[PDB]
């Protein structure tokens, strides 16, 4: 019937920074998931709670497509039970996560000579992010025993940091576009069967 607009999620021209990741809810459509699995221009395609083959046979209450940009050696953190600057302060997956983490190298799009410093990630936080929580605040982080009151300095840091993508960077430091597909269960989004 209705086509699940996965192409508009994956082939979007611009992606959000991981700190302010985008979530698109997908609903009332017939998703063809092998379009992704049967064509591997992706570097990672890890599913949790479902097997990738059986995705076209199952139905789910809702689908959420979260998208953002990180660097290669951080894709490992987009998994249940991970720790790190991304999993703790930027994008946290739950322990009972049902869905798939899809990533692919975007060096040709998100790196530029002289450096692309547009993409940001959060460096600190008072507490770790709860699953599927999002923090877009820019309060000066108080790492010390003295209030910052808006001025950066000793133990008073701006919470977000730029990535600095240059085309010459090692593959572990190159930009990677990431789409996380979360399947909410309880038949608004179904496969072709």
């Amino acid at each position, epitope marked *: 019937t209705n086509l699940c*607009p996965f192409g*508009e*999620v994956f082939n*979007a*021209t*611009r*992606f*959000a*920074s991981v700190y*302010a*990741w*985008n*979530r*698109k*809810r997908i*609903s*009332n459509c017939v998703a063809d998931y092998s379009v992704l699995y049967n064509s591997a221009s992706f570097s990672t395609f890890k599913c949790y709670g479902v097997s990738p083959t059986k995705l076209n046979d199952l139905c789910f209450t809702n689908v959420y497509a979260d*998208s953002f940009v990180i660097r290669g050696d951080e894709v490992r953190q987009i998994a249940p039970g991970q720790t790190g600057k991304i999993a703790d302060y930027n994008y946290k997956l739950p322990d009972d996560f049902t869905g798939c983490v899809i990533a692919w190298n975007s060096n040709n799009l998100d790196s530029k000579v002289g450096g692309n410093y547009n993409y940001l990630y959060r460096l600190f936080r008072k507490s770790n992010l709860k699953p*599927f929580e*999002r923090d*877009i*605040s*820019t*309060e000066i982080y108080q790492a010390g025993s003295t209030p910052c009151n808006g001025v950066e300095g000793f133990n008073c840091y701006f919470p977000l940091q730029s990535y600095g993508f240059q085309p010459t960077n090692g593959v572990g430091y190159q930009p990677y576009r990431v789409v996380v597909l979360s399947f909410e269960l309880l038949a608004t989004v179904c496969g072709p069967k």
Partner: antibody
Framework: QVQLVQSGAEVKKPGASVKVSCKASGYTFSSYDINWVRQAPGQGLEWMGWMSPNSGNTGYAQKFQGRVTMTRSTSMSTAYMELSSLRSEDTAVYFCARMSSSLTNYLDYWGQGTLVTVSS | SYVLTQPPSVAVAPGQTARIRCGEN??????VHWYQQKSGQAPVLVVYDDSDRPSGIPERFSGSNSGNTATLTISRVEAGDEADYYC?????????????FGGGTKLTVLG
């Protein structure tokens, strides 16, 4: 029912400041961001910024960065919006809205609006 | 950062159907929401998540987002639908994570 009760109308002369209030009722103030929207007379909606009652942190549109301050009072569940250096272009109904729980981000419940009129 | 460009005016007749177009590049990358504002009143949420409607909103309202245009289909148009209709997105793919509205569209039910 969740209710967003704003404050009364205000008439100000150019160069002054205005502080609109917005009391929240039937939910947990600290569980939803409060956004502020603006509407010139018979004109479109203009978004101003978001406030997080829990953390108190903010995020403003660049058009208002430096002239807007959005605060809160946890004790009596009231969000405040303050625009300084007012001019006639700032004549508008000033709206108060709760952002959705869904990171989808829709404004599920709005306020009555506060008319501030700036003239000499 | 992106701008949502609506059509300033769209006029139909009672019993007809009105279609309001919200436009943006890769607008299918995000979820479009729709509000109704009747003259001298606050906006009320009519469609959220592209197609889902809140409780108590007539089914003759419907939403869709298929690429670079989202449309609010208001069918079996009554008189109380004469209002200003606005679309909204949350855009963090630009310079600053902002909430963006469109210019609005007035429905003159013309009946």
């Amino acid at each position: 029912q969740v209710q967003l009760v704003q404050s009364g109308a205000e008439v100000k002369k150019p160069g002054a400041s205005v502080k609109v209030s917005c009391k929240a009722s039937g939910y947990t103030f600290s569980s939803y961001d409060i956004n502020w929207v603006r509407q010139a007379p018979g004109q479109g909606l203009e978004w101003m910024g978001w406030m997080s009652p829990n953390s108190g942190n903010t995020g403003y549109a660049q058009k208002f960065q430096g002239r807007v301050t959005m605060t809160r009072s946890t004790s009596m569940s009231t969000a405040y919006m303050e625009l300084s250096s007012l001019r006639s272009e700032d004549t508008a109904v000033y709206f108060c809205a709760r952002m959705s729980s869904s990171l989808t981000n829709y404004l599920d419940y709005w306020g009555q609006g506060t008319l501030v009129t700036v003239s000499s | 950062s992106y701008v949502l460009t609506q059509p300033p005016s769209v006029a139909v007749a009672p019993g007809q159907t009105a279609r309001i177009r919200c436009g943006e590049n890769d607008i299918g990358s995000k979820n479009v929401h729709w509000y109704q504002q009747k003259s001298g009143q606050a906006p009320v949420l009519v469609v959220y998540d592209d197609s889902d409607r809140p409780s108590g909103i007539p089914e003759r309202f419907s939403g869709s987002n298929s690429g670079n245009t989202a449309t609010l289909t208001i069918s079996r148009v009554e008189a109380g639908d004469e209002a200003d209709y606005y679309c909204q997105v949350w855009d963090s793919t630009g310079d600053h994570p902002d909430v963006v509205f469109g210019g609005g569209t007035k429905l003159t039910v013309l009946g």
